[PDB]
Amino acid sequence: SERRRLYPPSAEYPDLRKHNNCMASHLTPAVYARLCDKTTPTGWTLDQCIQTGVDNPGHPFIKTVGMVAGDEETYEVFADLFDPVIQERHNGYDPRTMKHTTDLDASKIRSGYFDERYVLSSRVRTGRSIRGLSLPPACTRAERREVERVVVDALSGLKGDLAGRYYRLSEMTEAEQQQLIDDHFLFDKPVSPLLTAAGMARDWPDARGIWHNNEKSFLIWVNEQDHTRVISMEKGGNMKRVFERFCRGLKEVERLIQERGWEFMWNERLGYILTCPSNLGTGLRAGVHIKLPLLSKDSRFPKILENLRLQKRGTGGVDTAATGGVFDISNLDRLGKSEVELVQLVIDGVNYLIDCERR
Amino acid sequence: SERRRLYPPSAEYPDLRKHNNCMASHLTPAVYARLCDKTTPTGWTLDQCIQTGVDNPGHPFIKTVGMVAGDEETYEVFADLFDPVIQERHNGYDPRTMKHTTDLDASKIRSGYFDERYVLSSRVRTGRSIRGLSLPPACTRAERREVERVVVDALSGLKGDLAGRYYRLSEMTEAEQQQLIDDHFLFDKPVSPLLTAAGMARDWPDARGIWHNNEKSFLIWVNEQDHTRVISMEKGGNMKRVFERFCRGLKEVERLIQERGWEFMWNERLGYILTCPSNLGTGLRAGVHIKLPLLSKDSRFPKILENLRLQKRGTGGVDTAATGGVFDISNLDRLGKSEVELVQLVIDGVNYLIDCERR
Amino acid sequence: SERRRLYPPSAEYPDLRKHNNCMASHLTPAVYARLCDKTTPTGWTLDQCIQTGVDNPGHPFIKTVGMVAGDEETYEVFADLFDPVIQERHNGYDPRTMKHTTDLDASKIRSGYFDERYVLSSRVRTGRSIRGLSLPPACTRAERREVERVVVDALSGLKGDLAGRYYRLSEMTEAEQQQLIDDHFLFDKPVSPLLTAAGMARDWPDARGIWHNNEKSFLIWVNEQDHTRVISMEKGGNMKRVFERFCRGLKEVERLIQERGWEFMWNERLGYILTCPSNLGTGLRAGVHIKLPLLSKDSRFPKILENLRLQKRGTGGVDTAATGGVFDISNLDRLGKSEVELVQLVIDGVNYLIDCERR
Amino acid sequence: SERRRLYPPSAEYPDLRKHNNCMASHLTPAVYARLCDKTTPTGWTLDQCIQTGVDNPGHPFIKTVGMVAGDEETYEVFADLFDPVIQERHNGYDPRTMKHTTDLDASKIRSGYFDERYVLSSRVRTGRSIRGLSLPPACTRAERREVERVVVDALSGLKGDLAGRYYRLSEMTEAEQQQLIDDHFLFDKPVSPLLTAAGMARDWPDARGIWHNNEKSFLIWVNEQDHTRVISMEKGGNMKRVFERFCRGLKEVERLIQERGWEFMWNERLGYILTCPSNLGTGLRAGVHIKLPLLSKDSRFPKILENLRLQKRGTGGVDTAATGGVFDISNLDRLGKSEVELVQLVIDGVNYLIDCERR
Amino acid sequence: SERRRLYPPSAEYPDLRKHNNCMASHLTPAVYARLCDKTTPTGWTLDQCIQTGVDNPGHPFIKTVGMVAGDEETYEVFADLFDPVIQERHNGYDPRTMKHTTDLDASKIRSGYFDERYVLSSRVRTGRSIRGLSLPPACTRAERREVERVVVDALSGLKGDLAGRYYRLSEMTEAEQQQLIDDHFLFDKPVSPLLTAAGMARDWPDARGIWHNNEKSFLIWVNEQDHTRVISMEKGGNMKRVFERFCRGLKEVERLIQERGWEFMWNERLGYILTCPSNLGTGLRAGVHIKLPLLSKDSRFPKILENLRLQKRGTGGVDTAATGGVFDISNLDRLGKSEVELVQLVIDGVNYLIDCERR
Ligand SMILES: Nc1ncnc2c1ncn2[C@@H]1O[C@H](COP(=O)(O)OP(=O)(O)O)[C@@H](O)[C@H]1O
Numbered sequence A, B, C, D, E: 001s002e003r004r005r006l007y008p009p010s011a012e013y014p015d016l017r018k019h020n021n022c023m024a025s026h027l028t029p030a031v032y033a034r035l036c037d038k039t040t041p042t043g044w045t046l047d048q049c050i051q052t053g054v055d056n057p058g059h060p061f062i063k064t065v066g067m068v069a070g071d072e073e074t075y076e077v078f079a080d081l082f083d084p085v086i087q088e089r090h091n092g093y094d095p096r097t098m099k100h101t102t103d104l105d106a107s108k109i110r111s112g113y114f115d116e117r118y119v120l121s122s123r124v125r126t127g128r129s130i131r132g133l134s135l136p137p138a139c140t141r142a143e144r145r146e147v148e149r150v151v152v153d154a155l156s157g158l159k160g161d162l163a164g165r166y167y168r169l170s171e172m173t174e175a176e177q178q179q180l181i182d183d184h185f186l187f188d189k190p191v192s193p194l195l196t197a198a199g200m201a202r203d204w205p206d207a208r209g210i211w212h213n214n215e216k217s218f219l220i221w222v223n224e225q226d227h228t229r230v231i232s233m234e235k236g237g238n239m240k241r242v243f244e245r246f247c248r249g250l251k252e253v254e255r256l257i258q259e260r261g262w263e264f265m266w267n268e269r270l271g272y273i274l275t276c277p278s279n280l281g282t283g284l285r286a287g288v289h290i291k292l293p294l295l296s297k298d299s300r301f302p303k304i305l306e307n308l309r310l311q312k313r314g315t316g317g318v319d320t321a322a323t324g325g326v327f328d329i330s331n332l333d334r335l336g337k338s339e340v341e342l343v344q345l346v347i348d349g350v351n352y353l354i355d356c357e358r359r
């Protein structure tokens, strides 16, 4: 009969004593019990949200979040757990009291030029989901293929310097993909436990690819970690030009996507909705590489970085260490501030770092 | 299991880039997604509402609405889409803030006499639904037959000059129906794509007919485009008399219909509920034919017509062009203003047109 | 409460006294009552099946069926009504006792050459549905677009003489489409009441097009009346060559469609499932045009045609009359016999007609 | 409404053109469509069954199955797909026509002694599930903890030479676990994509451990890849003694588990139910290491191995290559034959290999 | 969501290692798992059936069954567990292969007279349920009151020597009830754990009472342990007369109960349905007291008793020991054999015991 009893929520509670994710810092038995039975309309559950954080006590190179979203409803169905995490992840930003404003106008940028001797590369990046389609962690094969078709068709309409063709991973050979990776264009097959535990590596490489303009200064990653990933790169230190191309291409892509009736996932309290709560808000991760020896003279590096709200990864990916001195220095926060604001902050921070080389 | 995913709403969104209906001007992906799952208690869905507008980019002779209603709940279940369309269709009339008043008293009419040399014919028209019965676009065979029986029985009680018999289309021969059509009494079999796409031509001619008084000055169309269509005609220019007969017969029909327990569909925010949102409000389309050469001297005709809120169709139906000069000039708006007001407006407008003949 | 009563089935029964479809000849109140409540898993109902036959008493040029299918389940959910109709439509073929065999090998063809002076054109045709997708009468916009994408992608893999590109109707201009029509390649916009009543003209021209090889001797119609329509044409009388190309291209298309995981709708009792029960079985309609005066010497034409199981339409479509003498003479039955058998029958019949010209 | 359509099954079908699992060799669109909607009572779906095979085209060292089970119902709910795979995996064994017999009596063993100079190590292994508890691929945290408690309590009752204590992975230090691994006692953290794709690495290391007797000749792995894994090891070539201890301890464990009311999952058609269909039947993988140079003189090794139904992995795990010559040679089939039969087959095969060293 | 898992059946399995009921001898984890979810239409579950046996390892004076029924469906809903227990309880009587015959004709009795010096008292007893009313273990207050009213009204119609009035326990004083108890007429308040664990003591003494004829030779117990308990007593050894009165009164009670439309629970495979499976079949427990010293000369008493299928309780109830020598000797089996057969067996057995006094 219905007299049969279920396992009490505490019987399922994760053992997070040794873990260090930002999820474990905020998952309490009360919250887990509250959300144990809920679910998003597509079947996403809390356990699926917190699985990746549960499996990984921490990351060797940078503090993580520990949870991913399955669709747009997750950020509201499971808000009670997420909002404290989003607040902690983005320094002092309540995701239930204040709103988020997005400005993609590069005309307001200042300076934007780095000492080419010290910065080498200049990149900007973002991401965009498609409403009505499950996010990569939870998306089925059909949903992923639908995302791929929508973006491929929409991007086919781009004209001018932002013109190219879409190369599907299933077509590229190992050598070509490896060359694109080593060139810092393509994305790597997901082997990190933080991605495979979240479910973002199912059915690889099906329905995933890259669309890059002829000069490869404007790239789009389809179905790697997010639905979309709009990158603009230029080997140099003219952040202004790369950012200008990035925003122009972003506006064009948005136009050509809405022309077909689709719309990018978005809500006022959060901005563009992305899988990992780290990327919430603007998704923007404007940043540069750095000449090794010039910035290799750094004693209190992490303290200054934290003061400047800058992340320090390795040249080769977040999952790699910095060798020789080349530090992939990017911005930390993505939500709350606007894209122009974040890029100006990155410009000021990197210029400050250059001024502090003091060889 | 239930893990199977549905086609996202955008995957169904219509391709209305080239269309020009008033539906396409107001259907946005947000609205379509919102109403994608809803339905009226009888099974009417949004796609069924917008199908006719989807199929027809536009009409060669006059701007259209593009959607039809299935029953009375449609105007509330799918209000989010309709209300902007009703507002645009009837110049500046919010269907969710202001109310509608109906006055069917011809004693307040003034003048009402046209120059017979220039107007030829004088007609008034309206329509009336029956509560509890699905509208023609969605009505089943049994519902249509029930409507026919209700109106036939109720109208059988009419006495006096408004006295006649009901001729069922299934009984009339081709010659008789053709003569009535060419005489401007009967209605034509639905062949226009704007009607067949809406579903108002199923099971033709079953359960449809005409009831005309002995002098044919008072006609009722049963189950052609609406449940009811109460027309009063007189070959001449005495709009006052035709309108007086129209309102008197309308009151008598209403009385004899309520006597049996039925009631005409009606709500304060909209007035009498009719299929095509063009006819909402009063359903009244008082108008006249016109002598050709006298009004054939017109240079800026459409501008003056739009100024006077008058529609210009052809002598033979909205689906026909005006040849020789005979312009079927009627009123445009039906909701917001009262029947007496609309008829007085038509009188003033047509008299103004006559005064502007200036041969 | 639930004490409320529904309209009895007889209250909905269609008035088919004057109609002449093959549906009306077999729809009885018992059958209508039995299937009144049933439905296919996708929502297809009996009334939707019989609507087109209800609306059209008959066709001016050839006897019709009167019903269409919504998906593959319809032929089993509503079998009680269909099977007598399929039996009558295809002379003496029970669709519930005997099986259907399909053979698409042109190597077994004999003769295959006509007197070019008398036949002019040589065409073969068929159709193919996609499993899991609703048929054109019932298909939604998303389903139609999915069909279009599946066939476009699959056909893109064709190589050799069967090589071309897919032209979408939304792209072709009016002049180009008209030229293709008059050339007997493209299909006409649906205006016939027998098609618009069935619902096969919704959302026109969205998601519909034609893929023709470079020489246009191999064409595919996407989303006009069926999911697929594989035509092979050659202006001449070498039926053998056109049929060989037709079958080879059909096999290649099937291969390239299954490569992606899809499959053509098919069951042993019926063969390939198509919308109009006339086309059930093989869908094959091999036939030729005819020189006018040579076959204009015919006294008892319909009797001989019925003897030979050949249909006689007009040069320009089934919805047109034969003028000058050019008679579009094709085969009647499609189910029960195999494609090779039907084509050999057409060859023998047309050769017999030529032998009977007897000028 | 319910008129909304689902993604057709083919729209979800995996792209297995390049894959080489035994799953892809037998997954057809018909089967996938048939089982697309089904599910086991605990929520296991077909996509979850085939995910691991989908993600991995193949394994570098040995042919795989490609699917895992979620519970005991999976082998019946999804039988249509599994049974051909089980038939192929275990040479010519229909899992729906013939039955399986298990005999765990070592008294019937013959010889059982190897040339210690050539075999080094002698091990036997198996596995056992617990009825009512979800298998590791699908098990929740509470279910895994319940399994751990059941086995820990039951095994606590063992007495005699089969006496020890249970060490929980969460307690062991990195050095101790590494030493046990290198000693060939403990299991390695799951990093192989064939295990992480299946979901058998969630919540690691929670609720997992090893129970080994004082001499470590009898080990039990709790919650690594199966519920249970009963290994008996002895550095030498006396397979008879190790197998005797293995079967005696297995019988004792079964007794002490049923004493508490639990029961090992088991059905006649399949024997003990285990996750990977490779291990179905008896779970037994009796096998030995081998001296390198003595068997390094091998030309047509794989042909003889296939003739002898023996698998050849590396000394260090299936996920490692054989270096120096030490070949981890085990038995292939597990279902159909009995444990005594399989062990005798391994004995004969390894003795044959020794006789064929022919230095 | 529904992903939450229930406690596996084994997690609920009772700990019956030390118990000795006939339930524990036949409850296996397979059976418990099978019936874990089932239930009778009134909500009776297996756990409720086996609770009393679980709580009581055994009875000090006689072997028990360990389970009770909640209604008539229990013996079919939970037949898998009961049937072996009924088979063991009633020596060699399958409750699913053979049928039961009831004969209540005392005219076929022989002898029926005991040596008054050795037997003292002569009693017969039975019980009868009311169809449609839950049995005492599961009955609610309203159901118990309904049973009481039905039996009181039906018995009010008795006339002749079987004539009396019904005394309600709520009306009797402590002294009167105690005197009736010590006189061996009334029943004792339930304090034995074997009754209170079953739930047959709820709401005591509400809705329970005794109806005894004027001479108290015919008594009926209402709502003590069963719905009905029809006892006939006579201080003496004329079993024939007491049994004759018992059967006559039973027939009269049955008649007067069916007159009102009710019916005694009964099925062919089991006979009259009673709570404790010990009483199944006829419910008959004809038996006598015994003079102490005459039968106090007994060495192998239990062996002879088991040979003769006779139970030996104490003078004062089954929950009391036999002191002085007065042994309440009754019959054991109730199902399979008929009432006349059982009474003749008791007569023969007690006469045999008297013959074996051999003082
Ligand atoms: N500033 C940069 N210049 C050049 N390449 C970059 C830069 N930032 C990231 N990349 C490239 O992106 C890939 C992975 O980026 P990652 O560190 O994961 O950032 P994100 O998550 O924003 O993509 C690597 O191949 C790396 O070469």
Ligand SMILES: Nc1ncnc2c1ncn2[C@@H]1O[C@H](COP(=O)(O)OP(=O)(O)O)[C@@H](O)[C@H]1O
Pocket (backbone or CB within 6 Å): B121, B122, B123, B125, B181, B183, B184, B185, B186, B187, B285, B287, B288, B289, B313, B315, B316, B317, B318, B319, B328
């Ligand atoms: N003023 C008029 N005089 C005569 N006939 C008219 C007039 N207005 C409309 N009709 C008749 O109405 C029929 C269709 O009119 P239509 O344009 O559909 O107006 P409505 O939509 O109000 O019916 C035609 O057959 C036409 O003869």
Ligand SMILES: Nc1ncnc2c1ncn2[C@@H]1O[C@H](COP(=O)(O)OP(=O)(O)O)[C@@H](O)[C@H]1O
Pocket (backbone or CB within 6 Å): C121, C122, C123, C125, C181, C183, C184, C185, C186, C187, C285, C287, C288, C289, C313, C315, C316, C317, C318, C319, C328
């Ligand atoms: N034998 C033929 N030769 C040339 N054109 C043909 C032939 N048969 C059909 N057509 C063309 O097909 C179009 C419509 O064909 P239709 O009569 O509807 O046959 P189907 O239903 O098989 O398509 C017309 O434009 C017509 O020109």
Ligand SMILES: Nc1ncnc2c1ncn2[C@@H]1O[C@H](COP(=O)(O)OP(=O)(O)O)[C@@H](O)[C@H]1O
Pocket (backbone or CB within 6 Å): D121, D122, D123, D125, D181, D183, D184, D185, D186, D187, D285, D287, D288, D289, D313, D315, D316, D317, D318, D319, D328
């Ligand atoms: N015959 C053997 N002798 C010694 N160690 C073994 C033997 N077989 C397996 N192992 C040990 O088992 C571990 C993994 O075994 P694996 O190849 O996964 O087999 P299984 O799947 O049966 O556990 C390794 O650490 C390996 O050292």
Ligand SMILES: Nc1ncnc2c1ncn2[C@@H]1O[C@H](COP(=O)(O)OP(=O)(O)O)[C@@H](O)[C@H]1O
Pocket (backbone or CB within 6 Å): E121, E122, E123, E125, E181, E183, E184, E185, E186, E187, E285, E287, E288, E289, E313, E315, E316, E317, E318, E319, E328
């Ligand atoms: N042969 C008998 N003579 C007198 N009283 C009896 C006899 N058998 C039973 N009783 C009375 O029945 C009561 C309980 O009997 P019990 O052992 O429960 O038998 P049952 O289960 O058939 O009622 C006691 O109070 C006892 O006095």
Ligand SMILES: CN(CC(=O)O)C(=N)N
Pocket (backbone or CB within 6 Å): A063, A064, A065, A066, A194, A195, A276, A278, A318
């Ligand atoms: C690197 N990140 C960001 C994070 O989780 O903090 C990934 N989600 N992979």
Ligand SMILES: CN(CC(=O)O)C(=N)N
Pocket (backbone or CB within 6 Å): B063, B064, B065, B066, B194, B195, B276, B278, B318
């Ligand atoms: C002519 N009209 C009015 C309209 O749609 O605007 C019809 N609904 N047919």
Ligand SMILES: CN(CC(=O)O)C(=N)N
Pocket (backbone or CB within 6 Å): C063, C064, C065, C066, C194, C195, C276, C278, C318
């Ligand atoms: C011409 N046909 C065939 C038929 O219906 O008989 C169409 N279904 N349109």
Ligand SMILES: CN(CC(=O)O)C(=N)N
Pocket (backbone or CB within 6 Å): D063, D064, D065, D066, D194, D195, D276, D278, D318
């Ligand atoms: C090594 N195996 C066996 C197999 O899948 O064939 C695992 N299931 N991991």
Ligand SMILES: CN(CC(=O)O)C(=N)N
Pocket (backbone or CB within 6 Å): E063, E064, E065, E066, E194, E195, E276, E278, E318
């Ligand atoms: C004495 N009995 C009989 C039995 O359970 O065996 C009771 N059910 N109380």
Ligand SMILES: [Mg+2]
Pocket (backbone or CB within 6 Å): none
């Ligand atoms: Mg990255």
Ligand SMILES: [Mg+2]
Pocket (backbone or CB within 6 Å): B225
């Ligand atoms: Mg009209």
Ligand SMILES: [Mg+2]
Pocket (backbone or CB within 6 Å): none
């Ligand atoms: Mg055609």
Ligand SMILES: [Mg+2]
Pocket (backbone or CB within 6 Å): none
């Ligand atoms: Mg292993």
Ligand SMILES: [Mg+2]
Pocket (backbone or CB within 6 Å): E225
């Ligand atoms: Mg008793």
